[PDB]
Amino acid sequence: PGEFFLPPLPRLLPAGYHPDAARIEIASNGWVRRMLADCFDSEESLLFFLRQRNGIYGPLTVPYAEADRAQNIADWYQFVTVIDSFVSDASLYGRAAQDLWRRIAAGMSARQVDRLVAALEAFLRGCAEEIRSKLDKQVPHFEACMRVRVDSFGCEFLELLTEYAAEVDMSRAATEGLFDEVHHHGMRQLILVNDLLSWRKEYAQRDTMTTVRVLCEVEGLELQDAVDRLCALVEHHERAYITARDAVLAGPHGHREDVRAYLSGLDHLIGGSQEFEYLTPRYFGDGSVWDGSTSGWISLTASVARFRDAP
Amino acid sequence: PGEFFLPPLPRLLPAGYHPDAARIEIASNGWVRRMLADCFDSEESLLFFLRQRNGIYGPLTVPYAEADRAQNIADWYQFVTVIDSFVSDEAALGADHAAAAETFAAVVADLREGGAGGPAASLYGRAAQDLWRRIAAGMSARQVDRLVAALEAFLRGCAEEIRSKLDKQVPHFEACMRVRVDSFGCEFLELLTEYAAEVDMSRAATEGLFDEVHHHGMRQLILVNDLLSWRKEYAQRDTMTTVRVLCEVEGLELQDAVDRLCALVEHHERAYITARDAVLAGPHGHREDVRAYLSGLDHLIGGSQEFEYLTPRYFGDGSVWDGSTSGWISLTASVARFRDAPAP
Ligand SMILES: [Mg+2]
Ligand SMILES: [Mg+2]
Ligand SMILES: [Mg+2]
Ligand SMILES: [Mg+2]
Ligand SMILES: [Mg+2]
Ligand SMILES: [Mg+2]
């Protein structure tokens, strides 16, 4: 292919920066050095990771949260992103997971601490299944990909950390299934935006678990036609997320402030995530610096990329 | 000597980030692309400039300002930093008097198109005109005239540094601080501090109310910049830094120079606080506009130090700030950060 067009995406949902996002990014960088430095082969490898500005992802997901909780969340995402990067490449990571657990557990119910360990297990089980899929060089069909990505994208910790940020416990509502539709469309929107923006990286790293590879290699589509398909698919799941949300709100439990708070959380999680995914050198290449552009022509293979108004 | 130790600095003054700092930095990068991309030799050398994160300096200095004014100041600082980097670069300028002066005249002309009625022919002139129309809108006629003097001051400053480099003549400390009041853009910093705080201190300034406040605050700002920018000025053979004055004029080894200037940062920081507290206890100290201006200077002084620990401009391209502020700094490494111990 060489160069494709990413069109304007709907961007219907609030996308806000925590008032302390820039400072939180730096302190998170601080935490990654103290806790995770020895995970990298060199200072060169650590700085490659820190230049992805993954520290600002957290505060872009919870712009509403108390600074302490925003910082806790920012460090969690750097932590799981380090693991996520080695997937694609106490104990070693144990001391880091313990610092996070000690910091986050203090502002969680007992049932939420159980859900966080389960959510991490789900992520790792997702990751493990991606490793086998990649070693065997077998790309799954669309739905199978999405099934693996519910675990691998870390939907359960995305949902739980939303609660943690909003200072609610939706454990009872979850078991009951109040957010089943909301989560289906919300997580699938999150995943497909990510698939679209992380394609340069996953293409380069031969990662298998992405709907761009499924559309290209298993459905045999041209890149532009796959990009146009998933872009339309993002609009679907985003509009249905809004519909399913508006239904919980209009419905029986929708007057509750805890439900309203959690759903406003997901709103900012979905819009904030996309803002980050345009920002990060992780997707646009080491050396890239975001200029604020959000659509246009971009290179699949160039070491660094950005949206231009012509090929 | 391949490294030095930077002790903890007092950091008594507030260092706040604008609640929109990250987004403003990005929008500032967008403005540098739109306006200045063709001032760089290539996309790669434009990215080298943007990786310095100069776009977050503005929001770290006026964290209390309305978003639009913060954005204007952010774009301003990226623009002057592009200019500072161009005219301190002998490759871009020339390595001999004749050539340096020709290229410098061109820059002076281009930047004077800034407040003119006609469209600018130059990239620098068009960037200056955009910033002029944006900032001057929110200024009094007196502030606008002061903005003209302040650019004139900056350029007189840069020209004395350029001459100094060419003639291989390091100034004595007081000459260095005289030059740097101009070359550091102090008149701009004070004016923009007024604009951010939405006040007009034209009379007060002329009357001399802030003479001690400005003398001590600007000296702290310049000294802290000389310390954090030495890594890069050493490599670039710049002469207008107190680190080079103490080493070459006064005969001091690097570590003694560094220790002396850290003590001087503390002297001028406390002197700033005393001079400021005096105005606040004086007959103008009750005025809301004076209170806002002096809080604006507090945040300029604290904010600037935070930025100078953050920027890859000083710690090397590829560097990423981890929040550390004290320890051992390599002069030779391609990327530097503060460490607990010297290289064995
Ligand atoms: Mg991945
Ligand atoms: Mg993954
Ligand atoms: Mg991805
Ligand atoms: Mg200069
Ligand atoms: Mg300079
Ligand atoms: Mg300097």
Author numbering:
A (entry chain B): 32 to 120, 152 to 373
B (entry chain A): 32 to 375
Paste lines from the article.
A promiscuous DTS VenA containing an atypical 115DSFVSD120 motif was characterized to catalyze the unique cyclization of geranylgeranyl pyrophosphate (GGPP, C20), giving rise to 1. The monomer of VenA holds a typical isoprenoid synthase α-fold comprised of twelve core α-helices and four additional short α-helices.
Specifically, Mg2+A and Mg2+C are coordinated by ten oxygen atoms of Asp115, PPi group, and surrounding water molecules on the same side of the active site. In the opposite side of the active site, Mg2+B is coordinated by six oxygen atoms of NSE triad (Asn256, Ser260 and Glu264), PPi group, and one water molecule. The hydrogen bonds between coordinated water molecules and Glu192, Ser214, and Asp257 were also observed in the PPi-(Mg2+)3-bound form of VenA. Meanwhile, the PPi group forms a number of hydrogen bonds with the “PPi sensor” residues Arg211 and Lys263 in the NSE motif, and the 344RY345 dimer in the active site of VenA, which play crucial roles in substrate trapping and conversion. Meanwhile, the guanidine group of Arg344 is rotated towards the PPi group, thereby forming a hydrogen bond.
